[PDB]
């Protein structure tokens, strides 16, 4: 649909294939300029150490950052996730 | 500035919580006559992130519990070295983006 919807599937789809990543929980994404801003939350192994849950963050965001163009910002946040759950990623675009 | 007193009571709150190595950064602003707050903890890079979620949750009950009105208090966890003596920031700017975090 619109180039925001097109950023924000891209950068999901991106995510979601990066090793240790269980999924997108959140996603926020808005324009700054004619560049977007974006904060994502993705779901790690409970049982994952905090430095390999921060290896994994920083692999988003350089599979992000590489492929997608007019980034002006890109923070990768993380929580644990179990199996089983299944919630689809979660979008908004308001500032906070 | 009552500002400045709360922020530095925070701090001290939330190093005394076991699991924390310090905070790194805290964000407070008013919110009416109410302080609103995100704030960023050290812990053990070994922990587990379940560990530091727990830890988190711990400096939120003991910031908010000692505290008066506190709006909200976000608190997340950053792996960080026992050697590091970096003094907290409370720098109001975005983080780097090789500085990644665990929340919520």
Same mark, same amino acid.
């Not at 993705?42 to 997608?68: L, M, R, S, W, Y």
């Not at 179990?82 to 906070?96: A, M, V």
């Given at each position: 649909? /619109?180039?925001?919807? =097109?950023?924000?599937?891209?950068?999901?789809?991106?995510?979601?294939?990066?090793?240790?990543? %269980?999924?997108?929980?959140?996603?926020?994404?808005?324009?700054?300029?004619?560049?977007?801003?974006?904060?994502?939350?993705?779901?790690?192994?409970?049982?994952?150490?905090?430095?390999?849950?921060?290896?994994?963050?920083?692999?988003?965001? =350089?599979?992000?950052?590489?492929?997608?163009?007019?980034?002006?910002?890109?923070?990768?946040?993380?929580?644990? %996730?179990?199996?089983?759950?299944?919630?689809?990623?979660?979008? /908004?675009?308001?500032?906070?």
């Amino acid at each position: 649909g /619109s180039h925001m919807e =097109a950023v924000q599937n891209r950068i999901v789809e991106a995510a979601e294939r990066v090793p240790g990543v %269980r999924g997108v929980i959140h996603l926020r994404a808005r324009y700054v300029g004619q560049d977007i801003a974006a904060d994502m939350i993705i779901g790690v192994d409970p049982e994952n150490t905090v430095e390999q849950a921060h290896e994994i963050c920083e692999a988003v965001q =350089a599979a992000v950052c590489g492929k997608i163009r007019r980034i002006e910002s890109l923070h990768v946040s993380a929580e644990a %996730r179990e199996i089983g759950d299944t919630t689809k990623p979660s979008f /908004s675009d308001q500032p906070l």
